[PDB]
Design a protein around this ligand. Structure first.
Ligand SMILES: Cc1cc2nc3c(=O)[nH]c(=O)nc-3n(C[C@H](O)[C@H](O)[C@H](O)COP(=O)(O)O)c2cc1C
Ligand SMILES: Cc1cc2nc3c(=O)[nH]c(=O)nc-3n(C[C@H](O)[C@H](O)[C@H](O)CO)c2cc1C
Ligand code: SF4
Ligand code: SF4
Ligand code: SF4
Ligand code: SF4
Ligand code: SF4
Ligand code: SF4
Ligand code: SF4
Ligand SMILES: [Fe+3]
Lengths: 304, 435, 194, 187, 202, 191
């Protein structure tokens, strides 16, 4: 009555010790993002997470399975769709966006890690395309307000007087709940690199190529100011570096990281949109099997 | 010296501190021996022997009916109770000879006590008489291994000294207790081959072992130190050749195509035992280990003792283990039962505790990318293990999954605890079936 | 009198969109209000009966190298007869405009049909399954277009049914969002029939 | 399987030719209904925008020279009631081709947008009656776009979230107003 | 009338000339009674000890390549892991209680289910020949003793007792040749273990 | 209207399958493997393009003395029928089975819904020649690009057991392509 198989150890860390380390790793970025926004922004993040998690729980009872809720996939997706919203929306619009984030993009395509794209970007693209006027608000200090990415083209608001570059790190800049606190998001990526959750080969190449496009473009009081602006600090760290979307190969990663700034910065500058860290990762995530096929590691004994 | 390594790998936990600094006590046998003819790779020898004969140490038990088989020898003097068939832990019904110990320890005399005069063809023959297996890993007879067909000229002989595996101290002792003898045999292994210079390849983690060795290598030319970095799987034959002489092994190949022939140190000490001390394989070191055992131990077993009595000699189970292990923790097969006879291909025994041995029913693969990072061969396993389940064999062959060494490293890092290797093993058997 | 089953064979099994997946190209382009598609399916129905009645009188005299060029020309003549009806008799001036009217000569269904069936089917044996096929066509629209319209504006047949603020969803009516409704709805057609 | 090109070519030419003849006969018969129905749809949109005029005649001597491509004069018998002005200001995503009705009394009676490339479902469209109906009875003076509450006499409420579109439409009408004062008041 | 001629002559400047390029270039370059699968294993949980708890794939084809040759004490029964339900899309086969069982009236005879099993427990049989053997054993029966209570013990009375002799003792197993059999059916009481099973449609 | 404005205009921001739904009927068909699926678009870089030259000959002066556009719907499409039975002869010239692996769509290459829709599109703006030809090569590269991208998704979807029973094969492909349209929706301000 003795258990048997062929390797006998398989010990390092469970996917709960991956995910849960990410759910603890963004906590200084969220606690730094929340106290300007008060309780007002807390309702969208708790109700979007709990709606996302119980929406996966309805699909475990469809075709039968053991519940993966305890692997903590379902919490990370919820905690990232809530980062994309400005705080003044009614809650049901995110709750239907979390139901799209699970039930279509993840559970129709398979289980955890089989989907070809990030759900939070797909639910966000569905959200911003369906009710943009609900998404227009930039609630901080009461009034609707300008954000730096619109004024940097100069094409839009008459009212512009840009915040000083130190003020963005504190989080005083308006816009969405996570992305403004770029220094504590650096504190969370500095924690995540210490656990060897993720290689440098995506964030370093992606931040480097949008810095080259913003430097030859010339657009800012400094070229450096664009890198902390917007969601791009989330998109080099939490978004594109997601296991399931990301390519497996060591060279496949850096082609995906160089080519993400080929498409993001063009929507930032030549494009009419305020930002490109979203609609850019969905195209480069759809490119991945054509990357992963032709880019393979060299075999240890190739002929010739 | 500087610590060379191959490009990719893991750092499995180092369990050796329980066992590393203890004497090799002899185990005198108590219960009856059984000898299974099947222990060498390839087809078993039929025994010559039949029931009720007197038998002795160093008798051949059975002529090797094929090009790749090697002579058996009894561990002990005794009598033939029965040419009984018996299970191995694989569950093949191997032929075997029961030998009750008489307790008397008769041995046939044989001595030589020089190598230097001898013709090299007399060495390959006396090594076919000795019947010696290559001791670690997969278990070739060494007499085919010393004889390439001529066109693949040697450049060198590294030993494969690097005992990468957790909890396996069995080679570290042979280095402390008898370093001349292993360099003596090396000088021998080098008499059969000139042009090829010799190298030791010990890991840095036994720094005390090479620092004992370092005085012995000063007075002679072709042997020299090559310390290596601690990384599983250094003991695989295809990676150590890239590590030292820096040719890459050809795919599908043999070590003679790389011009060098790895050996275990245990084989070295036993080739020295055959050409000089005149005796074959009565014995090998087990390393029994694990916290469920009442003490860590390092027995010299007499071949063909039942494993149950051997672990009871080691102190027995503080609690019942959930996974007794032939061989090392990774590569080795697990026991069907404790009852099985010990065999020359055993190099150690483990008795894992609940604190490790509990795994989980697996989650779906997350596409983490760690398994491509940790394969030494830069094979891309998740497509291969996914290819056996649909049996889409052209994807197995374009990915070159016939190549893989079954190191077990690709299962070891997975957060999902997908266990890939059994799908790799079923696909490697199906490619032998239909190609 | 086999018309009753030949129709249920054309709509349960030969149906253009839920099964056969020819002819999606109007079926997603026209859906943005359901009337426009009910007129797209009715105009598709009268051209679908009218192709097979003319082509099966023509059927015997075609060499096998040119099985398609006569068929695309007679559908071009039939297509023009209706587009000239569209400019004159009954424009209604929404189905005249937001339909992509020329696209019925290059509808994927009818030429993917006439080679498959009306060539080897009888001239009479063509009027019944063409009427049924066209009927399935509107049906394979109207169940979809009521769903895409009701989750859009909420104005089924153009008419309000809810407070305008609760239903400002529109992405369905947009171009990505109709495909998701087909991937819900045809999966609902298969799961009952599984 | 005889496939000679002479037999094929004569049968081919025949079938294509009979289809072309029949289409030509249909073409000669259909011209008059198309002309009345086209005239009726232009006149119907025109009567809805400028209800005091019954008859409309294009001022064919004046080719537009700025963003205006043509003008239609509105009469009720001999009296001039106004003009319909086609304009295409640059919006955020492209030109907004629209007709603007202007009375001889100097009020904008309304607008109708014809092109569908302006703001593809983003915000609320300018074609919505809640926005487009606000231009009725405004003075023919420069209208201004506001952030906030409407005053009436000179303010146009921007579509929420689509302030760029409202600025573009209001710019196009104001340029049409400027065209009215320089080319249209008194002929 | 004068404008009617223009569509047909203007069509004729593309008119013949595409069929001038076409076929001038196209001429340049133009049985028995049906078989039915049957399991030859009876090992419901209680009737055979498994020697060991099994970490693994939960597919039967994977379980061959582990020490101990899969979970059963018998080397030759099915494991019950159910990899053969994946290949029979017709779904005659239901696993229950750790064994496969074909449903007797759905199976096509399509025969891929034999090749997928490492243990080769399936044998195609004629549907008519209702007496059928039900183990795969290749062993002395004292090793069956501690293992499978249902098993054939190579006990060998059955070759003495069949008049038609549709039986032969190949490789320590019964091996019926079904066409010789008359289905006389005395053999079902002859086995103490009931390793034979008549399908009993009477 | 300039050539770099035009060639992006079918490649990305207003791709024929990903917003307009021109071309959707083949797009569920030979997506099955990328090594076959690129050759349907390599067939499309001729058909779409030589018909754009031949429809310009109708728009040059063969229509012009009639001074009526109405005949064109019965016209250049017969020339599109001429170009496709020419290319079944050269698919068989060395390597037939290249596009024969799903050859039920081989006829629909006469009658792809996109292939008229560059041309009626070309004939509903009265473009000067070379802008129409770079519009043809950009619609063919965008059709080839979306078909190869769905081919890289459906190689993965055929080797994934976890999808719900009813959904297997085709309906999940409608879930992708519209999600693939969700990817292209953010290009709208670039052109
Ligand atoms: C993954 C792998 C790891 C191995 N590790 C060792 C080892 O740590 N020690 C060892 O003596 N042999 C090891 N071997 C066995 C060798 O392949 C080869 O058999 C050995 O280097 C020489 O011993 P031999 O005389 O049996 O050939 C390993 C083999 C493989 C495939
Ligand atoms: C650091 C980290 C970040 C992740 N971020 C996301 C994410 O933003 N969205 C997501 O869907 N999955 C994310 N995942 C993986 C997630 O559990 C699941 O694989 C998704 O369904 C992606 O396919 C992340 C995983 C890790 C380790
Ligand atoms: S076992 Fe095979 S897949 Fe795993 S690391 Fe070794 S070679 Fe790579
Ligand atoms: S098997 Fe494990 S290591 Fe390999 S890709 Fe899947 S999750 Fe990552
Ligand atoms: S004896 Fe019969 S039931 Fe038991 S394992 Fe073997 S075949 Fe299966
Ligand atoms: S084929 Fe044989 S071993 Fe495989 S699952 Fe079916 S009965 Fe079990
Ligand atoms: S695979 Fe064929 S023979 Fe075997 S059970 Fe299924 S249908 Fe019957
Ligand atoms: S009689 Fe019964 S036990 Fe004896 S061999 Fe025949 S079937 Fe097996
Ligand atoms: S059924 Fe009757 S005839 Fe057939 S084998 Fe058994 S005993 Fe013999
Ligand atoms: Fe189509």
């Amino acid at each position: 009555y003795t258990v048997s198989s062929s390797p006998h150890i398989r010990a390092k860390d469970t996917t709960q010790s991956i995910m849960r380390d990410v759910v603890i790793a963004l906590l200084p970025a969220t606690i730094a993002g929340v106290y300007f926004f008060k309780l007002q922004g807390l309702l969208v993040i708790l109700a979007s997470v709990l709606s996302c998690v119980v929406a996966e729980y309805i699909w475990q009872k469809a075709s039968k399975k053991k519940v993966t809720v305890g692997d903590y996939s379902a919490v990370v997706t919820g905690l990232l769709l809530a980062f994309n919203v400005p705080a003044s929306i009614p809650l049901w619009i995110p709750v239907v966006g979390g139901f799209f984030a699970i039930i279509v993009v993840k559970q129709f395509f398979g289980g955890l890690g089989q989907n070809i794209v990030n759900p939070a970007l797909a639910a966000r693209a569905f959200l911003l395309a369906s009710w943009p006027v609900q998404m227009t608000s930039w609630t901080l200090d009461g009034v609707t307000t300008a954000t730096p990415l619109a004024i940097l083209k100069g094409n839009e608001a008459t009212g512009a007087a840009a915040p000083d570059l130190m003020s963005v790190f504190i989080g005083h800049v308006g816009g969405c709940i996570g992305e403004t606190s770029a220094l504590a998001l650096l504190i969370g990526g500095a924690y995540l690199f210490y656990k060897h959750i993720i290689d440098w080969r995506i964030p370093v190449s992606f931040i480097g190529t949008t810095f080259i496009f913003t430097a030859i473009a010339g657009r800012g009081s400094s070229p450096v100011y664009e890198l902390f602006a917007g969601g791009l600090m989330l998109g080099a760290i939490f978004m594109a570096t997601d296991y399931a979307t990301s390519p497996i190969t060591p060279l496949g990663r850096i082609i995906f990281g160089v080519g993400c700034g080929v498409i993001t910065s063009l929507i930032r500058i030549f494009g009419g949109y305020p930002e490109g860290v979203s609609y850019s990762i969905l195209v480069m995530n759809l490119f991945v099997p054509l990357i992963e096929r032709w880019t393979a590691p060299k075999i240890f004994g190739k002929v010739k | 010296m500087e610590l060379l390594t191959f490009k990719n790998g893991v750092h499995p936990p180092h369990g050796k501190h329980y066992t590393e600094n203890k004497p090799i006590e002899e185990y005198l046998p108590k219960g009856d021996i059984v000898i299974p003819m099947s222990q060498h790779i390839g087809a078993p020898a039929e025994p010559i022997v039949k029931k009720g004969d007197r038998v002795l140490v160093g008798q051949k038990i059975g002529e090797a009916k094929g090009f790749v088989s090697a002579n058996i020898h009894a561990s002990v003097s005794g009598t033939v109770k029965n040419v009984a068939p018996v299970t191995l832990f694989n569950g093949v019904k191997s032929t075997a000879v029961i030998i009750e110990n008489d307790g008397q320890y008769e041995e046939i005399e044989t001595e030589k006590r020089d190598y230097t005069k001898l013709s090299n063809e007399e060495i390959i023959n006396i090594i076919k008489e000795a019947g010696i297996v290559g001791m670690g890993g997969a278990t070739f007879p060494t007499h085919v291994k010393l004889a390439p067909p001529p066109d693949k000229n040697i450049d060198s002989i590294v030993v494969n000294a690097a005992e990468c595996e957790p909890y396996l101290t069995c080679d570290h002792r042979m280095m402390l207790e008898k370093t001349n003898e292993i360099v003596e045999g090396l000088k021998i292994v080098l008499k059969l081959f000139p042009k090829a210079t010799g190298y030791i390849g010990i890991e840095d983690n036994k720094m005390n072992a090479i620092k004992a060795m370092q005085e012995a290598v000063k007075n002679i030319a072709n042997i020299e130190v090559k310390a290596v970095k601690t990384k599983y799987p250094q003991g695989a034959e295809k990676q150590l050749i890239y590590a030292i002489t820096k040719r890459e092994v050809p795919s599908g190949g043999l070590p003679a195509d790389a011009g060098c022939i790895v050996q275990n140190v245990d084989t070295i000490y036993e080739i020295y035992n055959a050409v000089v001390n005149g005796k074959p394989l009565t014995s090998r070191v087990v390393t029994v280990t694990g916290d469920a055992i009442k003490e860590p131990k390092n027995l010299r077993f007499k071949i063909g003792t039942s494993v149950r009595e051997l672990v009871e000699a080691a102190g027995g189970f503080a609690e019942e283990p959930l996974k007794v292990i032939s061989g090392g923790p990774m590569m080795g097969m697990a026991m069907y039962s404790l009852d099985v006879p010990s065999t020359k291909g055993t190099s150690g025994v483990l008795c894992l505790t609940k604190k490790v041995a509990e795994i989980e029913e697996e989650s779906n693969c997350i596409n983490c990318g760690k398994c491509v990072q940790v394969c030494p061969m830069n094979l891309m396993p998740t497509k291969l293990a996914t290819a056996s389940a649909v049996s889409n064999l052209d994807m197995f062959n374009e990915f070159s999954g016939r190549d893989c060494i079954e190191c077990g490293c690709c299962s070891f890092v997975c957060p999902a605890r997908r266990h890939l290797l059994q799908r790799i093993r079923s696909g490697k058997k199906a490619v032998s079936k239909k190609k | 009198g086999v018309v009753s089953e030949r129709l249920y064979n054309g709509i349960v099994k030969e149906n253009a969109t839920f099964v056969q997946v020819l002819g999606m190209c109007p079926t997603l382009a026209v859906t943005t209000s359901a009337i426009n598609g009910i007129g797209m399916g009715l105009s598709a129905t009268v051209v679908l009966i009218g192709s097979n009645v003319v082509i099966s009188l023509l059927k015997k005299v075609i060499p096998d190298e040119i099985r398609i060029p006569a068929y695309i020309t007679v559908i071009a003549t039939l297509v023009t007869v209706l587009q000239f009806l569209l400019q004159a008799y009954l424009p209604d001036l929404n189905k005249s405009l937001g339909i992509f009217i020329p696209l019925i000569v290059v509808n994927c269904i009818i030429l993917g049909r006439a080679e498959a069936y009306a060539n080897k089917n009888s001239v009479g044996a063509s009027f019944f399954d063409g009427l049924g096929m066209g009927l399935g066509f509107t049906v394979s629209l109207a169940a979809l277009g009521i769903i895409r319209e009701f989750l859009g504006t909420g104005k089924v047949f153009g008419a309000q049914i809810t407070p305008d603020a609760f239903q400002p969803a529109l992405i369905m009516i947009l171009a990505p969002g109709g495909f998701f409704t087909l991937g819900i709805l045809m999966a609902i057609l298969n799961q009952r029939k599984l | 399987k005889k496939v000679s090109s002479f037999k094929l070519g004569m049968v081919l030419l025949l079938i294509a030719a009979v289809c072309g003849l029949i289409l030509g006969g249909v073409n000669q018969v259909t011209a008059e209904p198309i002309a009345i129905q086209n005239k009726k749809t232009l006149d119907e949109a025109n009567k809805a925008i400028l209800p005091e005029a019954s008859e409309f005649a294009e001022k064919t001597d004046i080719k537009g020279e700025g963003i205006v491509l043509g003008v239609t004069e509105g009469k009720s018998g001999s009296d001039l009631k106004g003009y319909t002005i086609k304009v295409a200001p640059k919006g955020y995503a492209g030109a907004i081709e629209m007709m603007v009705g202007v009375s001889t009394e100097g009020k904008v009676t309304g607008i109708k947008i014809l092109n569908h490339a302006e703001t593809p479902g983003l915000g609320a469209n300018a074609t919505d009656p809640k926005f487009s109906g606000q231009y009725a009875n405004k003075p023919a003076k420069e209208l201004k776009v506001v952030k906030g509450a409407a005053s009436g006499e000179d303010e146009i409420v921007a579509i929420t979230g689509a302030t760029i579109t409202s600025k573009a439409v209001t710019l196009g009408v104001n340029e049409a107003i400027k065209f009215y004062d320089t080319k249209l008041k008194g002929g | 009338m004068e404008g009617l001629l223009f569509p047909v002559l203007s069509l004729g400047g593309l008119g013949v000339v595409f069929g001038l390029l076409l076929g001038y270039a196209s001429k340049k370059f133009a049985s028995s009674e049906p078989k039915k699968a049957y399991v030859k294993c009876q090992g419901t949980c209680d009737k055979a000890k498994e020697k060991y708890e099994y970490y693994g794939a939960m597919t039967c084809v994977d379980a061959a390549n582990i020490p101990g040759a899969g979970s059963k004490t018998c080397g030759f029964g099915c494991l019950g892991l159910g990899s053969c339900v994946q290949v029979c899309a017709f779904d005659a086969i239901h696993v229950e209680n750790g064994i496969a069982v074909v449903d007797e009236e759905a199976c096509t005879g399509c025969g891929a289910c034999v090749s997928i099993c490492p243990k080769s427990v399936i044998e195609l049989t004629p549907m008519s020949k209702k007496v059928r053997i039900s183990c795969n054993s290749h062993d002395k029966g004292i090793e069956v003793k501690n293992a499978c209570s249902v098993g054939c013990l190579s006990c060998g009375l059955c070759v003495r007792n069949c008049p038609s002799e549709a039986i032969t003792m190949v490789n320590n197993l019964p091996v019926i040749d079904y066409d010789k059999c008359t289905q006389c059916g005395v053999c079902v009481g002859k086995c103490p273990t009931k390793a034979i099973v008549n399908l009993n449609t009477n | 209207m300039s050539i770099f404005t035009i060639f992006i205009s079918a490649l990305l921001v207003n791709n024929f399958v990903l917003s307009r739904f021109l071309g959707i009927c083949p797009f569920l068909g030979v997506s099955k493997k990328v090594e076959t699926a690129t050759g349907m678009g390599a067939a499309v870089t001729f058909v779409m393009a030589l018909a754009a030259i031949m429809t310009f000959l109708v728009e040059r002066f063969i229509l012009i003395p009639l001074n009526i556009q109405y005949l064109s719907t019965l016209a250049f499409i017969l020339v599109i029928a001429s170009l496709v039975q020419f290319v079944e002869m050269v698919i068989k010239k060395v390597s037939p089975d290249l596009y024969k692996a799903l050859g039920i769509y081989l006829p629909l290459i006469t009658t792809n819904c996109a292939v008229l829709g560059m041309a009626v599109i070309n004939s509903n703006e009265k473009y000067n020649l070379i802008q129409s030809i770079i519009n043809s090569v950009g619609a063919a590269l965008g059709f080839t690009l979306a078909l190869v991208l769905l081919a890289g998704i459906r190689e993965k979807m055929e080797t994934n057991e976890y999808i719900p029973e009813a959904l297997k094969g085709l309906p999940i492909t409608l879930v992708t392509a519209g999600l693939m349209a969700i990817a292209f929706l953010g290009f709208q301000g670039l052109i």
